[PDB]
């Protein structure tokens, strides 16, 4: 686990460490003051030379110049301003029905298997859940993965994210069947962009027949592409949203369930809170979410130890002194919430999963914790995701208990994002016996 090697190095060699595992020499920077300086100013922008790995994968255009991978400030800001409209408080409030719907479908599907005996991959079920939410919420589409459909589509995502991590030259070293990987990954990326054309087409047709579709992310990514010569920019945003809008939430759900399977005390307390704030309501209202304070803590603590988005890069344009170390200009700086969250200098007993760290009255972590990143390039979807995941967790806590199958490991793996090494295979029982 490469991130653990970074952690080791940050601990042993200081807040600024030169690394060589990527195609360009980079430096990992782990003091909270440098985080503040570089992430909190629009003077510092993403390094396009690192972001090319998302832009294009094995030669095949993927994220392109969409909202995540465009690094130029002006070009980024023009699109960010348009797309922000799909994330207003009212927009998000109007997604509650979709969150509630898909979370309820997941729960019923799990309860149907809850005989303490049938193994279910919670990683897969949570990815199906997150994908059906995103497709419906952002694009008006029903993927129905919870109901067994669109398997090829989640496959294609897995292949291409594997591809991104595999592209690392120091890792993309010397094995034989790198040829098959290339074709499968290229083919997956083309598949996904074609899905995109189909879905955009659907929307365009609806509009031509005079339907009034409520404005969603799709509306705004179309709006951001008005004067375009072709649809490539549009499809870059489709891919951006499709992936960024479900993969990280699915990873974060899967980590949280995996970790809770060994935290019976925390679980009991989550269950009490659920019963208390939502009782036996079937659906959550938006006001309910704010009261799931303890669940909120658990989710936060889950992101400290297990941040799916584990790093971000900024271009250091000119030679500069950083925590005492001279860093050459034109150097990619890596900031890692994964690393900092596991340093005992920033967190006491860092490997202990302790939700009280985010308890009320506790001081907020100060530039040592950023699972949605910070500053102008922080996650546009943070509130959407925090809503989404509390809805899913609250529903599960209300109705089900999980036992991890013996032999399942607690480890992580990097496939672009971090996610559980194992599929979080569980057996399930209805809550209470
Ligand atoms: C728990 C889930 C999520 C986590 C941990 C997460 C994390 C973050 C982080 C750390 C970045 C990267 C910034 C970089 O390259 O350094 C990112 C940006 C972004 N995320 Fe999220 N994200 C999540 C959910 C979502 C959701 C639900 C959506 C969309 C509905 C979304 C959309 C995006 C987009 C479009 C960007 C690029 C924003 C910009 O640069 O203006 N994310 N996110
Ligand atoms: C887009 C959404 C899902 C958020 C993604 C957030 C993380 C997971 C992204 C942001 C920055 C991304 C990388 C950029 C650049 C690289 C270099 C590349 O190796 S290299 O040989 O091409 O230098 C390996 C993948 C890696 C580390 C990335 C993994 C994935 C990465 C950390």
UniProtKB/Swiss-Prot annotation:
- According to its UniProt record, the EC number is 1.14.14.25
**Main subcellular location:** endoplasmic reticulum
Tissue specificity here reads: Expressed in brain. The mRNA was broadly distributed with higher levels in gray matter zones and lower levels in regions rich in white matter. Not detected in fetal sample but its expression increases linearly with age.
Where does the UniProt annotation locate this protein?
Endoplasmic reticulum membrane; Microsome membrane; Postsynapse; Presynapse
Topology in the lipid bilayer: Single-pass membrane protein
Query: Broadest EC class?
Result: oxidoreductase
Amino-acid positions noted as binding heme in the UniProt annotation, renumbered to this chain: 379
| Domain of life where this protein originates | Eukaryota
Question: What cofactor does this chain's UniProt record say it requires?
Answer: heme
Coiled-coil residue spans: none
Q: What InterPro entries does its record include?
A: CYP46A1, Cyt_P450, Cyt_P450_CS, Cyt_P450_E_grp-I, Cyt_P450_sf
Pathway recorded for this protein: Steroid metabolism; cholesterol degradation; Lipid metabolism; C21-steroid hormone metabolism
Q: Which SUPFAM superfamilies does the record match to this protein?
A: Cytochrome P450 (SSF48264)
GO MF annotation terms: cholesterol 24-hydroxylase activity; heme binding; iron ion binding; steroid hydroxylase activity; testosterone 16-beta-hydroxylase activity; testosterone 6-beta-hydroxylase activity
Has the keyword DNA-binding been applied to this entry?
A: no
**Alphabetical GO biological process terms:** bile acid biosynthetic process; cholesterol catabolic process; nervous system development; progesterone metabolic process; protein localization to membrane raft; regulation of long-term synaptic potentiation; sterol metabolic process; xenobiotic metabolic process
UniProt entry keywords in alphabetical sequence: Cell projection, Cholesterol metabolism, Endoplasmic reticulum, Heme, Iron, Lipid metabolism, Membrane, Metal-binding, Microsome, Monooxygenase, Oxidoreductase, Steroid metabolism, Sterol metabolism, Synapse, Transmembrane, Transmembrane helix
**Gene3D superfamilies named in the record:** Cytochrome P450 (1.10.630.10)
Q: What is the role of the protein in this entry?
A: P450 monooxygenase that plays a major role in cholesterol homeostasis in the brain. By promoting constant cholesterol elimination in neurons, may activate the mevalonate pathway and coordinate the synthesis of new cholesterol and nonsterol isoprenoids involved in synaptic activity and learning.
- Family, as annotated: Belongs to the cytochrome P450 family.
This chain belongs to the protein called Cholesterol 24-hydroxylase
